[PDB]
Amino acid sequence: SVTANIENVKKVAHHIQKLTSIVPEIGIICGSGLADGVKDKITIPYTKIPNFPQTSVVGHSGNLIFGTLSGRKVVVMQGRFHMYEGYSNDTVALPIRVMKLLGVKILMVSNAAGGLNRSLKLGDFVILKDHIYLPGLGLNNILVGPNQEAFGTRFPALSNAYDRDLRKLAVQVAEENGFGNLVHQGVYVMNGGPCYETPAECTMLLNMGCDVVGMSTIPEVVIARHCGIQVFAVSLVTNISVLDVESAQRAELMQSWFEKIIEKLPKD
Amino acid sequence: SVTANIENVKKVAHHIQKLTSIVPEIGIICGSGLGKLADGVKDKITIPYTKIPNFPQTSVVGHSGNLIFGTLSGRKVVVMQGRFHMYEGYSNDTVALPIRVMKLLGVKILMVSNAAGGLNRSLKLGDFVILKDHIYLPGLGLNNILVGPNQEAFGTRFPALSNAYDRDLRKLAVQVAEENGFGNLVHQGVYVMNGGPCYETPAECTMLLNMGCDVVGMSTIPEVVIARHCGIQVFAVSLVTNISVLDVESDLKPNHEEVLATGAQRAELMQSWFEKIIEKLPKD
Amino acid sequence: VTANIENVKKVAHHIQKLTSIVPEIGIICGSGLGKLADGVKDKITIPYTKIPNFPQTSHSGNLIFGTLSGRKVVVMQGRFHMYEGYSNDTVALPIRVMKLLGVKILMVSNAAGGLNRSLKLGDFVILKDHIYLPGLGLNNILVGPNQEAFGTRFPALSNAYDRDLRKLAVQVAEENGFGNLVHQGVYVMNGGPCYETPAECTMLLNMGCDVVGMSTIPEVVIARHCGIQVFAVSLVTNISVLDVESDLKPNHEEVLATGAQRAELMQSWFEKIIEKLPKD
Numbered sequence A: 001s002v003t004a005n006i007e008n009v010k011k012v013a014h015h016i017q018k019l020t021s022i023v024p025e026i027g028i029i030c031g032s033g034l035a036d037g038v039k040d041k042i043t044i045p046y047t048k049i050p051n052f053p054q055t056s057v058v059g060h061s062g063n064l065i066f067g068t069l070s071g072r073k074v075v076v077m078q079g080r081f082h083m084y085e086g087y088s089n090d091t092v093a094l095p096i097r098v099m100k101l102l103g104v105k106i107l108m109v110s111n112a113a114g115g116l117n118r119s120l121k122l123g124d125f126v127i128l129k130d131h132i133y134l135p136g137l138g139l140n141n142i143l144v145g146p147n148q149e150a151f152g153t154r155f156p157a158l159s160n161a162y163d164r165d166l167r168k169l170a171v172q173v174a175e176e177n178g179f180g181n182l183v184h185q186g187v188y189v190m191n192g193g194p195c196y197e198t199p200a201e202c203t204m205l206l207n208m209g210c211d212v213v214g215m216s217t218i219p220e221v222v223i224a225r226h227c228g229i230q231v232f233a234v235s236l237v238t239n240i241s242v243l244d245v246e247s248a249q250r251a252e253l254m255q256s257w258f259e260k261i262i263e264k265l266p267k268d
Numbered sequence B: 001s002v003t004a005n006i007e008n009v010k011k012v013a014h015h016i017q018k019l020t021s022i023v024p025e026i027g028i029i030c031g032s033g034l035g036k037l038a039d040g041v042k043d044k045i046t047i048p049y050t051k052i053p054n055f056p057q058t059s060v061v062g063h064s065g066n067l068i069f070g071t072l073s074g075r076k077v078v079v080m081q082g083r084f085h086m087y088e089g090y091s092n093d094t095v096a097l098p099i100r101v102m103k104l105l106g107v108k109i110l111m112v113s114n115a116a117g118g119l120n121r122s123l124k125l126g127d128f129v130i131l132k133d134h135i136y137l138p139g140l141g142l143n144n145i146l147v148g149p150n151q152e153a154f155g156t157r158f159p160a161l162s163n164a165y166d167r168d169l170r171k172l173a174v175q176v177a178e179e180n181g182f183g184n185l186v187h188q189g190v191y192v193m194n195g196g197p198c199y200e201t202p203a204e205c206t207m208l209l210n211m212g213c214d215v216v217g218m219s220t221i222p223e224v225v226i227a228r229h230c231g232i233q234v235f236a237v238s239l240v241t242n243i244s245v246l247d248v249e250s251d252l253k254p255n256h257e258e259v260l261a262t263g264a265q266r267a268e269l270m271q272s273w274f275e276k277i278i279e280k281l282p283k284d
Numbered sequence C: 001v002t003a004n005i006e007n008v009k010k011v012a013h014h015i016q017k018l019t020s021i022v023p024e025i026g027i028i029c030g031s032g033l034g035k036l037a038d039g040v041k042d043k044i045t046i047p048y049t050k051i052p053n054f055p056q057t058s059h060s061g062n063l064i065f066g067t068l069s070g071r072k073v074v075v076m077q078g079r080f081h082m083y084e085g086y087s088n089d090t091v092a093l094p095i096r097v098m099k100l101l102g103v104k105i106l107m108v109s110n111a112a113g114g115l116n117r118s119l120k121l122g123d124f125v126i127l128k129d130h131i132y133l134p135g136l137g138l139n140n141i142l143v144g145p146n147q148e149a150f151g152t153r154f155p156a157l158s159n160a161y162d163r164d165l166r167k168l169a170v171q172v173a174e175e176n177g178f179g180n181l182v183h184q185g186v187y188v189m190n191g192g193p194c195y196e197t198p199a200e201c202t203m204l205l206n207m208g209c210d211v212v213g214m215s216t217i218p219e220v221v222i223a224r225h226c227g228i229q230v231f232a233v234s235l236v237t238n239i240s241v242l243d244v245e246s247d248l249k250p251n252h253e254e255v256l257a258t259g260a261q262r263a264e265l266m267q268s269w270f271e272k273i274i275e276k277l278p279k280d
């Protein structure tokens, strides 16, 4: 890993700009579980980008996808970097800082999560309105280390981290497209991973006021807000958390939802 | 330290197999209270960690740890004498390797004891608390022993911990305690790991109790996580070596000498308990 | 360099060659103790940069020896915070150096957010206990081989915030007419460097925490480990926001400003405490 400072980020941004003329205004991290629908698209493999972080192979590398979507210029990250895999703070931060320099103003991110809130059902959508960053509370915050002042301040507040206006809009779109009944808003808590929670851990997290639980996202969100990118994030409830020791389907819908949100985003 | 990958683990397992012919089916990590257990082992061969290439090395005021093979209640066991605790600064790979070596040697069941403070207010000094679940605070916080590339030869990328403390082994242990006349000492509860090496402040204890924790210690969970990852069945018990202090105004305090002494007091009972459990384990 | 007896001895001896003051009280100036450094009489200033192997800061820090209310003190101007990326050994060494120099009591101030709903801006919250979130999570300053020359493998934190020093500090505030500003409570450490979200604040409050900050606990842990008595106060520089719907937010400039506002009061308070410390 190398440092996500202005110098290195500039270098990566410029290489990318030589491969495409698209200036992205919206960044999309897709998680669980569209990229096609993107029109006039060019695909850049991470492997073709000097110093861009590399992904988990098996046989297949990640891609950066530029193009348009609902008439908006977007860049899509296909292939994420998760802390449980062992990646450094700098590795996880760089792609987000590269988006900033490329022009990105809004980050949209989806993930899969377990449902703690007892009123949640399988397949529900839970818009993040706040989070609890357990690793960050415990000295593994993605921002630990010298601050890169070119991107943001030493002590960031996370006041309106999940932009309330984007949340309102997303609810409105779901409502008028007839699935407002699947959509909730709640608190996402990050478990460092890679283990699923024990029933005791789930019970503790619920009593902590958490609604859903996952292993991702918060580090990106922290980096995004740090450099002034607006954030929208949703969890797909892919399972109901088990609280007692004694104890691809929604993809099309989710894609359509993001597509219809982007179409209504206020454009400068 | 060497990565706990299949290559390195294989190498260590093979060296050990050259020093003994015992194929262990039960693995025992002696904590507080299992000091005497090591002795009762019959037909035993002792292998010092120092004689095992690439096996992690221990601390014990100079004296090295040992691996002890032999039989116990007619069952073939391997006993780890000397553990690796995270607060000592050991790596994830160091702590994981011994457990993965057991897997390749044939181990099917891991039995582990430890000492812990009593958070649940109904607990008494010297009580036995069988773990039925845990809260892995370091794991929640990105210091999970499994962080890093997954070793697929041993297990999956995203393990569930559904029945981590095998319910059948727990039921059996309760039965053995009951019929041998000490069922009144035995409880079941949730163990929470504090990374250590400090004892908890009263405020921390109060928080952990309200979190739903019954006992608190500094060990064990990492081994249990590695064991479950590679499909070994787990049985674990805490000896309550002290009552957690919840009030800043108190003058009671955790004393490591008193912790060691309680362990030594219940040691004979605990050894007998493990010995009688092993004797009733369903044998393939 | 490892904070072992050999390295600490080396640093202690170098310092002792630059000054004859044997300190009995150690002061870590946080938010509010800016002015305290000045009031120190007969003072010699030693810059960290002149001390071989002493940790380096992020203008350099200084070690200030001298007297204060007739007592011999050493003042650390410039701290080492974990969020900056410093090692356990780096944070621990200065405190271990104090031990060898003669320090018996550590006084520390910091700035914190107010979780307890009864707290007001500019209040003083004497620490009577703490919750060490990084410590619970395997990032305890003491992780690693134990340095036996300084203390035991498994330290208790029974009376970490000496009850007698707390009682005294309350008495001093009371008789000097600001007893109404002073509370006692539980301090929780957030590793940092981010301010807490409303959800995190809500969780921390329900955990039983009164104030939240990013410092102090590691030094306290090292101090208690080697048997130094500890006194620590938080200045409430902001009220924690518990609601996502609010438009109030933590502002570092307002944090700095509140600190500077109460600085004179805080200095006077530490000065009048030291004056009443039982002297061997």
Ligand SMILES: Nc1nc2c(Cc3cccnc3)c[nH]c2c(=O)[nH]1
Residues within 6 Å of the ligand: A032, A112, A113, A114, A115, A191, A193, A195, A196, A197, A213, A214, A215, A238, A239, A241, B158
């Ligand atoms: N911590 C946690 N994460 C998840 C996820 C996210 C995930 C996990 C593994 C593979 N792919 C995605 C889904 N459910 C949960 C959960 O319950 N807890």
Ligand SMILES: Nc1nc2c(Cc3cccnc3)c[nH]c2c(=O)[nH]1
Residues within 6 Å of the ligand: B115, B116, B117, B118, B194, B196, B198, B199, B200, B216, B217, B218, B241, B242, B244, B254, B256, B259, C154
């Ligand atoms: N955190 C915590 N740990 C323990 C232990 C574990 C132990 C092992 C060896 C020596 N000393 C302690 C026992 N009791 C406690 C406890 O109360 N809290």
Ligand SMILES: Nc1nc2c(Cc3cccnc3)c[nH]c2c(=O)[nH]1
Residues within 6 Å of the ligand: A155, C111, C112, C113, C114, C190, C194, C195, C196, C212, C213, C214, C237, C238, C240, C250, C252, C255
């Ligand atoms: N975590 C947290 N810390 C603080 C502080 C301390 C501080 C020191 C340096 C810069 N900024 C803040 C003051 N208030 C808070 C807070 O609310 N939360």
